[PDB]
Point group: C2
Chain length 258, copies 2
């Protein structure tokens, strides 16, 4: 409803001043999340970052505030400005390893130098590093769980495989970044260079499907892992020295197939 | 098979001495995971922590080694001893937030003082803090996804709810005993103080089930979140000051129910 969303827009404007007046050490206030992206819906939160000059500060504030006859959830992450700026070097936790553009809309800054540095459309994060070993380890756990008839073990370790395989596909696919978790699913399903079965198998292993069995899930995991390992260049800086050597020696393949 | 597992036992002993030779700065070597617990199976890896006296070493080694007519996957996490000891203060990433007893079997140490300090049956890790706000946010995302007919969005955000709920239940349940990820599932399913429908609903939301729909998943998430929230004590030390105040004011309930 237009009145609700106009109301939220007004709440956002009011909150900028409220945050300034509460945090004397604030140097910048940025809108984040759904309302920063322009894709919010009824239950979306209003998210702010409040960057302060006070070192090693890290608090999380929550409000629940009336907008007409509704209540909206407001969150503010209060953080040392420098620590906030530095986390651009760390991969996001929510993108299945994909590099991200964490949407930022600067609402207020204390001075010209700060405002210039922080008036950007997003903060970037790099891709997570490939985890070949942990992928293979998880496939072994799936095999063990099948052998002992432990369906939950198969489902759980298949989720591990599904969380790690995108780290392996990222380097061999065209570059893609995402701004939120739901889009990470879209981007990964869209990868053009993937092993046989991938799109369907990835959802099966991640446990984002209507129906599956332990047998069908293990088979999906097998296809993904066997498939992706065949598609990687033997680059020791990308995959690890031991891993690249084991691949060239034919040992990784022999281990998987024995 | 007996012959294989006997061979693995001999391999483990041999490898500890190989690692001692390779890492002249080693002070302790510990066996981890399934072979340390004594519950290994065919595809289990031999996992070592190699603790060294050199600061800021952090390497991950992999070997694939013959044991009779099979190949076994061996791993070694090579880490500064002090860094490894210190991480007992950090929650585990693999336990859905539950405190852990990370199994360790000391296979060698450089002197008796190091043995006295490090020869323990496990290294503990504390529970992750309750995340009330993020749980509510995820439920909101489920609602938004239902509203737009995005089944994958429902399944994805229901996983978020499921990953966060055990953190809420920890403080109202007796302490749990968890040494590996599969046992974390067993412990959570066994929590005595839980809302109606919990064990089934938790598996449904995590995705670890044979059959579900967007409708049934959302209904499970609603039951679980509403159920857990009404069981939480409104303790600011536990949940955070704002969250406790909002719950006491009835605002969180009003928000969820509106």
């Amino acid at each position: 409803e237009n009145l609700y969303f106009q109301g939220v827009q007004h709440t956002i404007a009011r909150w900028v001043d409220r945050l300034r007046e509460e945090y004397a050490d604030a140097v910048a206030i940025l809108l984040k999340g759904s309302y920063a992206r322009g894709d919010a819906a009824t239950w979306s939160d209003i998210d702010f970052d409040v960057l302060v000059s006070t070192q090693d500060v890290e608090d999380y504030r929550t409000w629940i505030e009336p907008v007409g006859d509704r209540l909206v959830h407001i969150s503010a992450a209060v953080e040392w400005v420098t620590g906030w700026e530095r986390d651009t070097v760390d991969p996001s936790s929510w993108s299945y390893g994909l590099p991200t553009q964490e949407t930022t809309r600067l609402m207020w800054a204390i001075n010209d130098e700060t405002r210039r540095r922080l008036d950007r459309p997003y903060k970037t994060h790099p891709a997570a590093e490939p985890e070949v070993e942990d992928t293979v380890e998880a496939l072994g756990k799936i095999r063990n769980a099948i052998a002992r008839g432990d369906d939950l073990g198969v489902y759980q370790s298949a989720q591990t495989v599904a969380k790690l395989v995108p780290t392996l596909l990222i380097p061999i696919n065209p570059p893609v970044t995402v701004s939120h978790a739901r889009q990470a699913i879209e981007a990964i399903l869209a990868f053009p260079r993937v092993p046989v079965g991938f799109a369907a198998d990835w959802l099966t292993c991640l446990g984002l499907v209507e129906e599956r069995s332990a047998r069908s899930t293990a088979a999906a995991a097998e296809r993904m892992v066997r498939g992706v390992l065949e598609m990687l260049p033997t680059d020791p800086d990308l995959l690890g020295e031991d891993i690249a050597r084991l691949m060239n020696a034919g040992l990784l393949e022999k281990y998987v197939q024995q």
